[PDB]
């Protein structure tokens, strides 16, 4: 009927983490290679993603219990959960009014089409928007949003994962804090938790769709040379 | 006492090549990651160099006799001669008035110091300027400038080179056209040829100094992640 310290301290760490690794002004985006509307958006979006990965790694490093895992398991979790963490956090900039990520003047306002100029179709780009909408509508609290990202990152079901027993416990601790929170601090959210977990299953699918499309793109050297070393390494298979 | 067709046709190809691969307005530079004056210039200059390599490969592909070499020998020559070709061509933007490469407003006006913010010192950055000055003062014709780059690219003395006998003949054909040209079309340039060849020996040194400094930088992952795949690959040793 009331959250305990360890839990409350878990929420404080995660929220501070997201804050130290997510800017609501999107000021660093000018440092990226400029957008251009033949895979013309590829250079900008590669920098966007590569940037975000550094952020996700920053957030992860501060997820309680994560630094305790082995370098190998940390890397296995990041690599597999990375793309999804990026989709979850991107929701912050998503705009239901225009069905696009609004991160600045018309320049940094990424709509479904600018992603196509980055090597992606619409058949697979449709579920992303479908996902960004349902997630948005959940009007999550920063606490639940931040938790969901931490819960998603500690999914034991990741190819490459060793200590799937510990990683499993951690995720359970997090899922519990998310349930208690929603229960005591989130009025009207009785179905919520279950809706949030469902969102992770969707991420799996979007994750698998990206892998495929990225695989083709990364295989063509004229395109991969547009990617950044960090991306090439995080989405690469040389594990 | 007068150039022959094959020679004249060699000069026409090289000049057209340089033209199709060198812009005197430097308009594409806005596409690079913006400059910033902790290796703050590294992101911009990496894009500058990576860009230039694509250009050098474009020029090379059109050097007469080059496409006839084996993929392997083409790659061996590019990799080893790349950095030097970049220093030779950069001379076009060098400004003796301010001892810097002027490629745009204060933004793209790279002076000796902005390179330091890219992982380089002054002990080794001094010979580059010393070299850019002497070269500039030679007031080369576009024909001699273009030749020199072709002659430099066909230096048989490159680690990795197989057919060092053919590559050797090609370079000789080019050195001959450069001598005839200077002799019949370049009044007052009696010492020139010899001065130009000396410039290649200097490139060797600058080339060796870069290798070392780049090696350190590329070894530190926090820095290499700033480089581009093409650079990482051209200056890398995985031959």
């Amino acid at each position: 009927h009331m959250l305990s310290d360890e839990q409350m301290q878990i929420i404080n760490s995660l929220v501070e983490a997201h804050h130290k690794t997510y800017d609501d002004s999107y000021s660093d985006f000018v440092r990226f290679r400029p957008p251009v509307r033949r895979l013309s958006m590829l250079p900008h979006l590669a920098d966007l993603v590569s940037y975000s990965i550094q952020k996700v790694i920053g957030f992860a490093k501060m997820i309680p219990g994560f630094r305790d895992l082995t370098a190998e398991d940390q890397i296995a979790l990041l690599k597999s959960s990375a793309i999804e963490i990026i989709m979850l956090r991107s929701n912050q900039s998503f705009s239901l009014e225009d069905m696009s990520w609004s991160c600045g003047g018309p320049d940094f306002k990424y709509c479904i089409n600018d992603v196509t100029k980055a090597g992606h179709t619409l058949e697979l780009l449709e579920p992303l928007v479908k996902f960004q909408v349902g997630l948005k509508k959940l009007k999550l609290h920063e606490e639940e949003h931040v938790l969901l990202m931490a819960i998603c990152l500690l999914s034991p079901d990741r190819p490459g994962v060793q200590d799937h027993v510990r990683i499993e416990a951690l995720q359970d601790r997090l899922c519990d804090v998310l349930q208690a929170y929603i229960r005591i601090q989130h009025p009207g959210g009785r179905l919520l938790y279950a809706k949030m977990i469902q969102k992770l299953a969707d991420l799996r699918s979007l994750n698998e769709e990206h892998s495929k499309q990225y695989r083709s793109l990364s295989f063509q050297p004229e395109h991969s040379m547009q990617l950044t070393p960090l991306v090439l390494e995080v989405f690469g298979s040389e594990v | 006492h007068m150039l022959s067709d094959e020679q004249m046709q060699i000069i026409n190809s090289l000049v057209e090549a340089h033209h199709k691969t060198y812009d005197d307005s430097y308009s594409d530079f806005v596409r690079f990651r913006p400059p910033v004056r902790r290796l703050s210039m590294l992101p911009h200059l990496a894009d500058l160099v990576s860009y230039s390599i694509q250009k050098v490969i474009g020029f090379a592909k059109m050097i007469p006799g080059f496409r006839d070499l084996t993929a392997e020998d083409q790659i061996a020559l590019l990799k080893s001669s790349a950095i030097e070709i970049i220093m030779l061509r950069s001379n076009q933007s060098f400004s003796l008035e301010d001892m810097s490469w002027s490629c745009g407003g204060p933004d793209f006006k790279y002076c000796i110091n902005d390179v330091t913010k890219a992982g380089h010192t002054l002990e080794l950055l001094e010979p580059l300027v010393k070299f850019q000055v002497g070269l500039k003062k030679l007031k080369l014709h576009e024909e001699e400038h273009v030749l020199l780059m072709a002659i430099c690219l066909l230096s048989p003395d490159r680690p990795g080179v197989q057919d060092h006998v053919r590559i050797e003949a090609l370079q000789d054909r080019l050195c001959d056209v450069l001598q005839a040209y200077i002799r019949i079309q370049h009044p007052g340039g009696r010492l020139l040829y010899a001065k130009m060849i000396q410039k290649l020996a200097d490139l060797r040194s600058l080339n060796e100094e870069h290798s070392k400094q780049y090696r350190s930088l590329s070894f530190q992952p926090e820095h290499s992640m700033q480089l581009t795949p093409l650079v990482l690959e051209v200056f890398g040793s995985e031959v």
Binding site: Q74, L78, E233 | -
Partner: peptide, 10 residues
């Protein structure tokens, strides 16, 4: 190897 990813995780 994961050169980059290793350095980043500190």
């Amino acid at each position: 190897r994961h050169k980059i990813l290793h350095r980043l995780l500190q």
